[PDB]
Amino acid sequence: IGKKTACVVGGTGFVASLLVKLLLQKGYAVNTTVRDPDNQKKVSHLLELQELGDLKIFRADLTDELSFEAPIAGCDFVFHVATPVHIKPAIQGVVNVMKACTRAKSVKRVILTSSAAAVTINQLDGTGLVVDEKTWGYPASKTLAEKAAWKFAEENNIDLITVIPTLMAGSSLTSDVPSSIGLAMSLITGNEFLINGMKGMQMLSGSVSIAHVEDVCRAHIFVAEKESASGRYICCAANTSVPELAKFLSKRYPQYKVPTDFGDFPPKSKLIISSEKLVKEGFSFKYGIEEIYDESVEYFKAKGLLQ
Ligand SMILES: [Cl-]
């Protein structure tokens, strides 16, 4: 029967977890993976999801192409998030996984997540970053991992499609908060460091582009299900600037004090990131900027990271 199966590597992932939960709700039979099941806190959100449907964990490292044989087998779709909200490891992580998809008839299609943003963004979680008085890459650019994924796929006739996101906010199943929201939320949080971060985001990528992880997630499935889908799919809901965002947050969040004056800082960003191709192929974004921020704000408080 049309009893549908899919595999979602690295189930701990901010994006991934959310896929799984969401797949399960769609009826799919989900297999996911993780390095070491033996962090009780780590999987804590994964256990809860079992309640929703037939979720079979598997234990996987991106180092043994063997790991993937187990979880990958029987699944119509493989979802691997190449660049997780947190270089050589991913690039290897993407071949192995793809390797295993050669060794299965079941796998009708692979859909991969890579973005330049996350790459950078997780640098911001890095240690020893230099501060001056007064990295960031072309948003539509292809990570090596992505680039590597494409080559292979082409060489081994696999059916790949990639989803290219930007700033991802909303809420997350995972216990700890993701850098990426904190950054999306720094304007409300008032974290000076993260604001400069986001300020750079604008100059060095020349856009403040954002999306809700559920929407980024749906986008992944939809493309997975749409038989007519070919290629890369830039997924961003909102386009803005650090000033014009902070104005906008000020005039929707009286409860909080969002810095409303930048002086020199450019009011417009150089680039607008369009998900037309995506929309053109028929996706509709549930969450706009307003709902992204209510969502992100309401989670943060629920996280106990607000007043
Ligand atoms: Cl993620």
User: Cα dist. 247→143, 195, 243 in Å?
Assistant: 33, 14, 6
267 Cα: distance to centroid of ligand 1 (angstroms): 30
15 Cα: distance to centroid of ligand 1 (angstroms): 4
Q: Is 83 annotated as a binding residue?
A: yes
User: Cα dist. 109→87, 96, 128, 133 in Å?
Assistant: 24, 16, 40, 49
Nearest to 117 by CA among 145, 87, 84, 95: 84
Rounded distance between C-alpha atoms, residue 117 and residue 141, angstroms:
10
Residue pair 173/16 in contact (Cβ under 8 Å)? The answer is no
16 Cα: distance to centroid of ligand 1 (angstroms): 6
The answer for residues whose C-beta is within 8 angstroms of residue 297's C-beta and 6 or more apart is 185, 188, 253, 306
Rounded to 5 degrees, what are φ and ψ at 228?
Answer: -85, 0
Q: Is 293 annotated as a binding residue?
A: no
Query: What are residue 234's DSSP bridge partners?
Result: 164
Residue with tokens 């796929």: 153
Fold for domain 1-307?
A: Rossmann fold (3.40.50)
81 Cα: distance to centroid of ligand 1 (angstroms): 7
Rounded distance between C-alpha atoms, residue 250 and residue 256, angstroms:
8
Q: Is 42 annotated as a binding residue?
A: yes
Query: What are residue 168's DSSP bridge partners?
Result: 211
Spell out the domain ranges in the chain. 1-307
224 Cα: distance to centroid of ligand 1 (angstroms): 18
Experimental method: X-ray
Q: Is 82 annotated as a binding residue?
A: yes
Residue with tokens 């911001």: 124
Q: Is 13 annotated as a binding residue?
A: yes
Residue 116 in tokens: 């330049």
Rounded distance between C-alpha atoms, residue 187 and residue 167, angstroms:
14
Residue pair 256/248 in contact (Cβ under 8 Å)? The answer is no
